Design a protein around this nucleic acid. Structure first.
Lengths: 107, 473, 511, 289
DNA sequence: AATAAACTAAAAACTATTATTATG
DNA sequence: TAATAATAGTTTTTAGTTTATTAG
């Protein structure tokens, strides 16, 4: 919406509390068009997770997407633009996310 | 039966919670009770309304009363409300926004309780109020005692324990061990609706109702509703016999039920299809009496239930069943009944083994006075393997395994074991409310316990091996 | 996986042996086709005019006609045996039909895999018989290894019937022995007990478990003798084809909002966490489930046998643990242990689990000693949720309903008379006056009769109710008369009122 | 109306959503007559009525599990009555099926319709609407339904009385039009039934009036045999008019428009009678309006 | 190289109402 | 020629129909 880069990029804020509460993260992601989805949607690029809870451990046990610490979403928001995957926030991540880590950073 | 016990959490704030301080342990008690209730009964309603407060937060706004989660079906709302305050830091923040011990009139809080119990619109069999205090907190009490007595007349029960059975002196007249309340009770469904009583065709002129209520039988996980994967809202699941060669959904005039038997699909109609299920009528058609000696008891293996009368449809249920169970002592037989729960049902040959009332000192209705369903098998389902009885008992072996195992003598508490799936997922629901891990595991005690201590009790089967190869692998 | 049973049917119309034999063979085929039992049967008729056997020994087999070769029982065979076979005009030797049928079994068995060979023979014995071909009849009987199971018309036998019985008995004692005479039964009456139901079992093979106390167990998966279940679910068929063309189910998952639908992925099986439905799926169950203890048949504890409750029985088999495979120490230990536990009454709580895909369980362990099989019984025991308990009016303490005492002696004599199962004798004779454990139910057999009705004639919708149980599911008139005076006291002293569940005519039919 | 009719026609093509207490009458509501009748419900009427008759034969049949189906019957009759407006009158076996189904609907009186439970009267009304719609067997099950209608019109519930009278007289019109040869014996038997119900006294002021009204209806069926035969009783009708209609008390003064029109129907053959029926005409007009 | 089935598949519960026949 | 009466109806927990490999 405000920054359409998060539009068409579904950020599954299903349980995010590391930086901001999950309702607040969902509100801000919809403020930029990231879809408020409670289980990774078809467009979910990465699950914006939070404190290591039942949902975060669901994502860890069932790697549908990453366990993204909402600090990665903070760096995305402050830039007002989707910041690529970084091996410094997402504790648990999809193999494509580790591949991105190796793509634009070292191991 | 509509009607349960409505419970409210009327907890005093007279700094009788603040001396561990009684507040934290009381909050653990109430949270554990709510954890039990959310997994047991939403029909029972829970009211987180505390008094003694520094605020007048209540409907009529009386002295030193606070409302947190009024009478409602249990849920994570009260769980989190008490969780934010359970800790000692939780206790101090609680005392910050709620308040500390203050003065008030107990008539006020009892009036608020009366309003709460008279505002709910559920036919409620019982009413209960819990209360916590370190010691006896106390005109101020005479009106309080009068109002408490009146509430007791209204079916309201009062619960209080002094957390100093030592010091509740000023409250002994006022009043009408919480380790059990610390989630000892948990996850027990409370439903009282079930099938209409069946008609026992005991003879050819009088039939008697039998009370078969599947109300306290097996309980399992909550209903998995096909919520939306995005917003967690269910779907309607439009499903039926639909068409592809002709398209759309087939109409009942176009649907025929057949049976593929012999060499052809024997096409019948739906009317014949569902009217074939009957051999006679609904009820317990009694053929006669079958001696209990003629029970396979290696085929009495399916899910079995109880057979109780029902002194509601016929006057003679209680009468004739009392006489029958009085004379069951001299009988080694069972009421040989055919069982149809409703119309168009294939009756099953049922032996009614007399399971009479085990009225203890308190006359607890364990094995209520009636009969237990004995399985009379048939010839289509048992995992039979060929018999081999060339092997009998040998004195050395029987003595050795006897000394190995005879020490472990149990009593078979029928409800001792815990269902893995049921309690597992119910406490997992508790954890979901807590937003935490898998809390704890339920199991039908399927890990053996004697094998780790049979040698501790002096096992000889391990000591005496019949072969260098494991004698029974 | 096949049984090579064989039939040998047929002055002949006179009770009449022919009608009884036709009844029992129509029974046989109808029972093998209702459950779709796979036991091929051949049929050669003696007396049916014409020496047209597939294998005739010089055509001396006068009036011998083959009906069916060794072929599976289907509705086609059912109707063929029902209709084609008619009594012959001039007499014939049933031993000739025996030779032809045995030769058919030889031809089929030598070339095809047959796991069983039998000869279900029902000869009316009223036809003139010649006993001169003993060598070839015994040759035919013994080459195909078909167990000659001959049955008698009635011993209610005429001179022709007597000589037929003696020739068949001598040929079978040269073949098998007096076992044939033991199974020789009257076509009606003695064979009528078989002529009312079916013997049936479900093909499967071993699916083992592990009695893991400290140990394992050797078992197998089958479905042989246990309470009746559905044979085949009602195969819904199109009114246009009577097959499966428009008989299939769709999924739309109409998102309950509102006509918007959902796909298979678009549903998450949210669980009703009391006040709210938690968004829950099997991925959530991964951290919210319990893992089973493999395929363990273990035992968790040992209890006194007195505490067990018949009402507290659950499961769907009993692991009748017999002598173990290739482990004689296992066999002796098992027998001694089950007998010693019976002596101690120290029944074990079988900590069972079907497999990792299923859930772990408890059980019971008490040995069932019988005339043939004497070993352990495993039935699952209740838990805190399986407390099958009924809350109603108590019986004995009810002084409000405390009836008379002539009723008590009435009930005692009624029990003595309605004991509708013979008490076990010294010969382990588990006799039942109304056998229930082995003889089937009355409504699955009702379906069998209805499907016979609709297969023999698709315009025959519904036959009379299956009296298979009804005739034998009633107390004898003697015991009812004995209790009548007790019943007189019961009815003259017990007060009660009417009941409900009154199913009347659904509409206003022409009456 | 077409889109919603199609939506609900697809809606009713599913399973297990029917269970409710009164919501089943949705189908009764689905039948529509205020529509302009495009091809949508024109085509769907066949499927709906086929389903209706099939499930009536299934449920309504004497059965063990199902002892009744009130919501089922009500919704089916509502939709059929409101949608059988499409002329399916003499085509094929559907006439037989629906006729015998209405017959077995209104053959017996299990429900207490005299006490305001007039669902059988609703069935009577639906049949009266669609008696001509299903005529391959109304000539078969014709008497017993007619006397059952007589009892229904003799019941305490005045709604039952009017509904049964309307259905019975509509059926009388049907059989008079398409019976008439063929119904010579049937016409004579109906004349005998008349004789019994008209020449004998009757406590109902409308019983003999509708008897002679059927005479007028059967003036055609007798006319193809002998209209002079009932013109012979027309003289008896003259006796009735000259004696009891001018004795004023007389409830046929209140109830002889049926008599007047029936006399016209039977007298279509005759031409001459001297000014007899005009004192009666004014008399019955005065005590009719 | 095909036998193996515990992955749920449905029906009474006292709610309570109308509906009586309230009047010539 | 004008009230009270029963289909009026439910938070239907088992119809006993899906998990489970040696048949070749």
């Amino acid at each position: 919406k405000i920054s359409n880069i998060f539009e068409d990029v579904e950020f599954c804020v299903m349980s995010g509390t590391d930086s901001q509460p999950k309702p607040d993260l969902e509100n801000r992601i919809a403020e930029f068009g990231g879809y408020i989805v409670q289980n990774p949607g078809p467009d979910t690029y990465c699950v914006i997770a939070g404190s290591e809870n039942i949902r975060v451990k669901n994502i860890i046990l069932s790697n549908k997407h990453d366990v993204v610490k909402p600090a990665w979403l903070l760096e995305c928001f402050k830039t007002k633009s989707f910041v690529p995957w970084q091996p410094r926030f997402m504790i648990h991540m999809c193999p494509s996310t580790k591949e991105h880590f190796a793509r634009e950073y070292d191991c | 039966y509509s009607g349960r016990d409505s419970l409210i959490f009327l907890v005093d704030a007279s700094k009788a919670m603040f001396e561990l301080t009684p507040f934290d342990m009381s909050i653990q008690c109430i949270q554990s009770v709510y954890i039990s209730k959310i997994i047991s009964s939403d029909r029972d309603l829970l009211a987180v309304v505390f008094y003694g407060t520094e605020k007048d937060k209540n409907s009529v706004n009386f002295k030193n009363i606070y409302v947190l989660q009024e009478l409602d079906n249990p849920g994570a709302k009260r769980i989190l409300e008490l969780d934010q305050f359970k800790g000692q830091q939780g206790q101090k923040r609680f005392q910050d926004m709620m308040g500390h011990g203050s003065d008030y009139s107990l008539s006020e809080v009892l009036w608020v309780c009366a309003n709460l119990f008279s505002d709910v619109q559920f036919k409620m069999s019982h009413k209960r109020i819990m209360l916590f205090t370190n010691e006896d907190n106390p005109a101020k009490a005479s009106r309080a005692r009068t109002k408490a007595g009146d509430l007791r007349d209204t079916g309201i029960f009062l619960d209080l324990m002094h957390l100093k059975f030592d010091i509740s002196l000023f409250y002994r007249d006022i009043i009408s061990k919480l380790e059990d309340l610390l989630r000892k009770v948990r996850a027990k469904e409370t439903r009282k609706r079930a099938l209409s009583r069946l008609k026992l065709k005991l003879n050819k002129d009088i039939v008697i109702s039998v009370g078969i209520y599947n109300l306290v039988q097996k309980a399992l996980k909550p209903p998995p509703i096909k919520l939306y994967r995005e917003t967690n809202e269910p779907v309607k699941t439009k499903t039926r016999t639909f068409n592809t060669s002709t398209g759309g959904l087939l109409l009942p005039s176009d649907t025929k039920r057949s049976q593929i038997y012999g060499s052809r699909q024997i096409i019948l109609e739906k009317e014949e299809t569902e009217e074939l299920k009957r051999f006679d009528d609904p009820g317990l058609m009694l053929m006669g009496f079958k001696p209990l000696v003629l029970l396979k008891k290696h085929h009495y293996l399916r899910p079995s239930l109880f057979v109780y009368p029902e002194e509601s449809l016929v006057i003679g249920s209680s009468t004739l069943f009392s006489a029958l169970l009085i004379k069951c002592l001299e009988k080694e037989v069972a009421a040989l009944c055919r069982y149809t729960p409703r119309r168009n049902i294939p009756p099953y040959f049922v032996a009614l083994v007399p399971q009479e009332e085990e009225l203890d000192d308190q006359k607890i209705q364990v094995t209520p006075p009636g009969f237990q369903l004995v399985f009379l098998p048939f010839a289509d389902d048992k995992r039979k393997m060929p018999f081999t009885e060339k092997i009998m008992a040998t004195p050395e072996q029987v003595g050795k395994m006897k000394a190995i195992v005879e020490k472990l003598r149990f009593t078979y508490r029928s409800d001792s074991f815990e269902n893995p799936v049921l309690q597992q997922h119910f406490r997992n629901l508790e954890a979901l409310a807590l937003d935490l891990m898998e809390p704890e595991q339920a199991v039908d005690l399927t890990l053996p316990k004697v094998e780790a201590m049979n040698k501790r009790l002096g096992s000889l089967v391990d000591e005496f091996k019949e072969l260098v190869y494991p004698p029974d692998y | 996986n096949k049984a090579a049973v064989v039939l040998c049917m047929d002055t002949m119309s006179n009770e009449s042996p022919f009608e009884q034999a036709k009844k029992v063979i129509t029974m046989f085929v109808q029972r093998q086709v209702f459950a779709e039992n796979k036991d091929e049967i051949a049929l050669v008729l003696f007396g049916t005019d014409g020496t047209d056997n597939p294998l005739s020994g010089g055509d001396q087999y006068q009036n011998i006609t083959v009906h069916r070769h060794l072929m599976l029982p289907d509705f086609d065979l059912l109707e063929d045996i029902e209709s084609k076979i008619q009594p012959g005009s001039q007499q014939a030797d049933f031993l000739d039909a025996l030779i032809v049928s045995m030769d058919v079994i030889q031809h089929e068995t030598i070339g095809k895999k047959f796991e069983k060979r039998h000869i279900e023979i029902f000869t009316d014995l009223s036809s003139r018989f010649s006993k001169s071909q003993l060598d070839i009849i015994i040759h035919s009987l013994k080459k195909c290894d078909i167990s000659l199971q001959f049955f008698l018309p009635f011993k209610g036998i005429t001179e022709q019937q007597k000589e037929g019985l003696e020739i068949v008995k001598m040929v079978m004692i040269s073949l098998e022995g007096e076992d044939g005479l033991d199974e020789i039964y009257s076509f009606s009456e003695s064979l009528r007990k078989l002529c009312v139901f079916k013997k049936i079992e479900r093909h499967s093979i071993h699916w083992p478990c592990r009695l893991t106390i400290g140990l394992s167990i050797r078992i197998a998966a089958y479905k042989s003798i246990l309470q009746e279940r559905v044979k085949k679910t009602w195969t819904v068929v199109d009114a246009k084809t009577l097959k499966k063309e428009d008989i299939q189910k769709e999924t739309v998952y109409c998102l309950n909002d509102d006509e918007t639908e959902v796909l298979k992925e678009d549903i998450i099986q949210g669980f009703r966490y009391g006040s709210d439905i938690v968004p829950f799926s099997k991925v959530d169950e991964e951290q919210m489930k319990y893992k089973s203890e493999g395929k363990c048949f273990s035992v968790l504890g040992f209890c006194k046998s007195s505490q067990v409750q018949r009402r507290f029985f659950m499961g769907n088999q009993v692991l009748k643990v017999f002598a173990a495979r290739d482990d004689e120490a296992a066999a002796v230990a098992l027998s001694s242990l089950i007998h010693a536990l019976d002596d101690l009454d120290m029944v074990a709580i079988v900590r069972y689990a079907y497999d990792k895909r299923a859930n772990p369980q408890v059980g019971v362990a008490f040995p069932h000693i019988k005339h043939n099989y004497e070993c352990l019984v495993y039935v699952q025991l209740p838990f805190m949720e399986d407390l099958r308990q009924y809350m109603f009016s108590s019986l004995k303490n009810s002084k409000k309903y405390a009836p008379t005492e002539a009723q008590l002696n009435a009930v005692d004599a009624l029990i003595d008379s309605m004991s509708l199962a013979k008490k076990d004798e010294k010969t382990d004779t588990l006799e039942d006056l109304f056998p229930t454990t082995k003889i089937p139910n009355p409504r699955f057999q009702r379906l069998f009769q209805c499907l016979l009705h609709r297969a023999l004639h698709p315009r025959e919708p519904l036959p009379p109710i299956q009296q298979h149980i009804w005739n034998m599911l009633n107390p004898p008139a003697e015991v009812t008369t004995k209790s009548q005076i007790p019943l007189s006291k019961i009815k003259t002293l017990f007060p009660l009122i009417e009941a409900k569940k009154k199913d009347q005519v659904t509409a206003q039919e022409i009456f | 109306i077409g889109e919603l009719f199609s939506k609900f026609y697809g809606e009713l093509a599913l399973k297990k959503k029917i269970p409710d207490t009164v919501l089943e009458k949705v189908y009764e509501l689905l039948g529509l007559l205020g529509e302009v009748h495009p091809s949508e419900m024109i085509n769907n009427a066949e499927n709906l009525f086929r389903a209706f008759l099939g499930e009536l034969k299934t449920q309504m049949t004497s059965a063990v599990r199902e002892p009744k189906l009130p919501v089922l019957a009500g919704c089916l009759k509502g939709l059929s009555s409101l949608l059988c407006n499409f002329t399916k009158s003499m085509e094929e076996d559907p006439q037989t099926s629906r006729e015998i189904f209405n017959f077995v609907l209104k053959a017996i009186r299990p429900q207490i319709d005299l006490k305001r439970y007039a669902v059988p009267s609703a069935g009577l009304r639906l049949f009266a609407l669609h008696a001509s719609q299903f005529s391959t067997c109304l000539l078969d099950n014709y008497v017993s339904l007619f006397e059952v209608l007589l009892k229904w019109c003799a019941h305490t519930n005045v709604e039952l009385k009017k509904a049964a009278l309307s259905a019975l007289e509509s059926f009388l019109k049907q059989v008079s039009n398409m019976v008439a040869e063929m119904h010579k014996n049937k016409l004579q038997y109906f004349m005998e039934q008349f004789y019994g119900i008209i020449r004998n006294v009757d406590s109902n002021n409308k019983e003999l009036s509708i008897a002679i009204r059927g005479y007028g209806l059967f003036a055609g069926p007798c006319k193809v045999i002998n209209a002079k035969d009932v013109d012979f009783m027309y003289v008896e009708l003259i006796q009735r008019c000259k004696q009891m209609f001018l004795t004023q008390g007389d409830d046929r003064v209140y109830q002889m428009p049926s008599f007047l029109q029936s006399v016209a129907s039977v007298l279509l053959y005759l031409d001459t009678v001297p000014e007899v029926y005009t004192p009666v005409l004014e008399h019955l007009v005065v005590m009719q309006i």
